[PDB]
Ligand binder design. Structure first.
Ligand code: NA
Lengths: 290, 286
């Protein structure tokens, strides 16, 4: 019944909840072995993504980037999805990529729903994550009861298929700013003979007592960016999507320029295998603490 | 009770702190509405000081504190005297004053406060303390009456001041990132209110984001809690502090320019939250 394309760190747990909730899934992944835990839960697997699509049915996708979504959602695949078909596109991609693809879906009477997820894999299993939806109202109304199974909050951002994507980029931009201001602040404290952990504990106990600052603050305090939750080069990819998006509506983003340079400089320093949180090491570099 | 306390400075934070100490039973010599609850007023601050006693000060800036804590007054505070300094001042001013205090056998405690006037009135605020161990042991029971959390940052008399400036810096950064993000959304045809509501009820669900985010979402920087030029003064203390320990602060440089440009645009009478208008100006929305 429901096609599910892309079974990475988020696709796997998302698909497991939809199977547990009684939905029939036909799944696919570029790496075929990732789908076998879902076959035990009732799902069916196919060798080619187009074999998973039902004319007028629902297809979910969760892929790494803009090129992965465009490569998969070819004209011939979208045409099979066809009239009244609905694509719930959960990848973190550009508003422009979403609006372009949404346009192609409407050629065949199908609907593209921009559905970026605000959840790390643990938050999905715990169903404490959130989703933003944008696109056709009838199509959002059809899939809203499905996505309620793996998130707490569902936020609607209207008709524009790329609007929810703007919110996701803005959210990730604010996370990156939080990392940077803590790097700066904790380095200033450190060079003043104050432990990074003590300033972190005080400030996030009170003023900055939100999950982003407590989870990311511990990384910045210890300045240990291993194990990896999101690979370092992927932070650069995301801030560049934000900068492109803002530039296209003539909006400067001075903080985002600084974040971008932290990633570029970090790659010059051989930090490609660290977590994206390691952008916060730039403040340590500049203050001579390498 | 036993401690007859000198309370110097009675502004927006000074008055509600002095109130709680008067209601808790402490005898206060301030420097008229506190005379009503049981205090005694003096004309010259030095006459409020008891040798070996305790003095609280909460003053508007570094200048106000150094001018009041002269060699004369600190000598009068003298042997075993304790000064609890609650002003948002630079660590350098605290460290300089502290050396003056110990030359005459007194102790300076850096004790900047993290609270709006309403958090003080509720005993919900936090305070950071640093300075001499014995002095903090003496005044902790007194500060516990008007704060919830007490955080000890050791012997360095300016270390608590570093935490305070870092906190104010992170608040300014939060205003700036919401200005940038909400302006990007806005120019993509999304209301500032909708992006604000989603992000500040999930990822950024802390009063700092929900309270300042509302101001940034409507670009209405009211009521005036902290005048715009005080934002520039505070970010300048952070930048000086960071420079003295050879630490660049690139976000703070951006914050500073938002205030300088706002003053060029005549915003001196708006709330410091209006630093967030910069993103709108740059995106051609003002
Ligand atoms: Na739910």
């Amino acid at each position: 019944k429901i096609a599910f394309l892309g079974l990475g760190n988020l696709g796997t747990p998302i698909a497991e909840i939809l199977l547990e909730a009684g939905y029939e899934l036909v799944v696919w992944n570029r790496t075929a072995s990732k789908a076998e835990p879902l076959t035990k839960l009732g799902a069916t697997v196919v060798e080619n993504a187009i074999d998973a699509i039902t004319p007028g049915g629902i297809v979910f996708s969760v892929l790494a980037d803009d090129a992965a979504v465009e490569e998969l959602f070819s004209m011939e695949l979208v045409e099979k999805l066809g009239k009244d078909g609905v694509h719930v596109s959960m990848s973190t991609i550009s508003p422009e990529t979403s609006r372009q693809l949404a346009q192609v879906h409407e050629w065949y009477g199908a609907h593209y729903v921009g559905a970026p997820i605000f959840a790390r894999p643990e938050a999905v299993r715990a169903k404490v994550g959130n989703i933003c939806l944008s696109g056709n109202a009838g199509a959002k109304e059809r899939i809203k009861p499905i996505v309620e199974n793996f998130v707490k909050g569902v936020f609607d951002f209207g008709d524009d298929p790329g609007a929810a994507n703007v919110i996701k980029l803005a959210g990730n931009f604010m996370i990156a700013c939080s990392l940077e201001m803590m790097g700066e602040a904790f380095t200033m404290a450190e060079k003043n003979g104050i432990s990074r952990q003590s300033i972190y504990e005080m400030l996030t106990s009170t003023l900055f007592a939100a999950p982003i600052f407590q989870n990311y603050g511990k990384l910045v305090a210890s300045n240990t960016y291993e194990p990896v939750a999101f690979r370092f080069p992927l932070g650069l990819k995301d801030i560049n999507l934000t900068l492109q998006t803002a530039s296209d509506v003539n909006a400067p983003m001075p903080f985002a320029d600084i974040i971008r340079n932290r990633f570029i400089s970090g790659l010059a320093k051989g930090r490609e295998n660290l977590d994206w949180g390691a952008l916060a090491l730039g403040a340590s570099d500049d203050a001579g603490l390498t």
